Amino acid sequence: TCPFYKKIPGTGFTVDAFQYGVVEGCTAYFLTHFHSDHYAGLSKHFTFPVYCSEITGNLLKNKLHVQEQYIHPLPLDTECIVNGVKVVLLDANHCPGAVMILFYLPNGTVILHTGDFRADPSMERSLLADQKVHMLYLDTTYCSPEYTFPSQQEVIRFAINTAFEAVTLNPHALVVCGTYSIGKEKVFLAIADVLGSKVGMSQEKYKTLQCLNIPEINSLITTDMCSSLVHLLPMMQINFKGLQSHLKKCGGKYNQILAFRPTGWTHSNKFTRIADVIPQTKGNISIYGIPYSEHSSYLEMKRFVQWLKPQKIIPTVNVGTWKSRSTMEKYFREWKLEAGY
Ligand code: NI
Numbered sequence: 001t002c003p004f005y006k007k008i009p010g011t012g013f014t015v016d017a018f019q020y021g022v023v024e025g026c027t028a029y030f031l032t033h034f035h036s037d038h039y040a041g042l043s044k045h046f047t048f049p050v051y052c053s054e055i056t057g058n059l060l061k062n063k064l065h066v067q068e069q070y071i072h073p074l075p076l077d078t079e080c081i082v083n084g085v086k087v088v089l090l091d092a093n094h095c096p097g098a099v100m101i102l103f104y105l106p107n108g109t110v111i112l113h114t115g116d117f118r119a120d121p122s123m124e125r126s127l128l129a130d131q132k133v134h135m136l137y138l139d140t141t142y143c144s145p146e147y148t149f150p151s152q153q154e155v156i157r158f159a160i161n162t163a164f165e166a167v168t169l170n171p172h173a174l175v176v177c178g179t180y181s182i183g184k185e186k187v188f189l190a191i192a193d194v195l196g197s198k199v200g201m202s203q204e205k206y207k208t209l210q211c212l213n214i215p216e217i218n219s220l221i222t223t224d225m226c227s228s229l230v231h232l233l234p235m236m237q238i239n240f241k242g243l244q245s246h247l248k249k250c251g252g253k254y255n256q257i258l259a260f261r262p263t264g265w266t267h268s269n270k271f272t273r274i275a276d277v278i279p280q281t282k283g284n285i286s287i288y289g290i291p292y293s294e295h296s297s298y299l300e301m302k303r304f305v306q307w308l309k310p311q312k313i314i315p316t317v318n319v320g321t322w323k324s325r326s327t328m329e330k331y332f333r334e335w336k337l338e339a340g341y
Helices: 054-064 121-125 152-169 185-194 203-210 240-249 298-308 322-339
Strands: 011-013 028-030 051-052 071-074 078-081 085-091 099-104 110-113 133-138 173-179 230-234 255-264 279-283 285-291 313-316
Touching: 051 054, 051 078, 054 071, 054 203, 078 110, 085 121, 121 298, 152 173, 152 185, 152 255, 152 285, 173 240, 185 230, 185 255, 230 240, 240 255, 240 285, 298 322, 313 322
Parallel strands: 011 028, 028 051, 051 071, 110 133, 133 313, 173 230, 173 255, 255 285
Antiparallel strands: 078 085, 085 099, 099 110, 279 285
């Protein structure tokens, strides 16, 4: 059955709750973003109203084949009414089309659901600042002080300069970027832009990108692999074996590969700075691990919550074990005691 952390009290709404069949009482199903854990259970067979951003609606329509009659896209930063309740969608700074939802309940309670997010100080001057928020449903992916990472911009600058130098040194080098869902598109778009190239990719991946309302997209991406010096492959192929194999397929148009694996956090965030990063190398193929995150670091999450000052916090990630919930409760109390709410 549908957990309490996916229900919004005093409405018949749910959020990211598609895997439990018909939820009793639910009149509107919200979807924060198009990642499989969150959409799990949605298909052409779903017949209830789904509320979401325009981008998320394009993906539902085209990738999952959800029938158009059930897709209710809403604009961002706009007060809307859904089944008699006022709502607002805000940018989550996660993957394309990802939203936070603000629910104004009829009793006067205000609830923020973050979905998946990467907290940023620009969220402190949105519509959130206009009134008190009583309850927060929080993306707690990285809720522990060891989880630090550089900014997106530091990582992109590093990627840019690395690729530019490698291809100026050897103009027959190919650049490859690994991927498994939407998100982290700036990695490959920024590398391509400094190399004067489009990004080449499979038909399924191109179809995905074509749904994302990216300006001038037709000038940036192609299905013609041969005409392009940056290629996208599945993350699973980003290894020496997979990369040698792809290099055989390109027809001796390239004689070297430089590949990037954008990851989340791994244990080497604790010492290394981005400027110290060195690749793994076997022969004419180099692989760089780069920690480009679309979730809040501990410090970014703490700052956001300490600003917002919610009366109650409901975690939405790592809630499956008592040990994790207990640990998270401890950090929420520290934050409250330090800031005085
Ligand atoms: Ni996500």
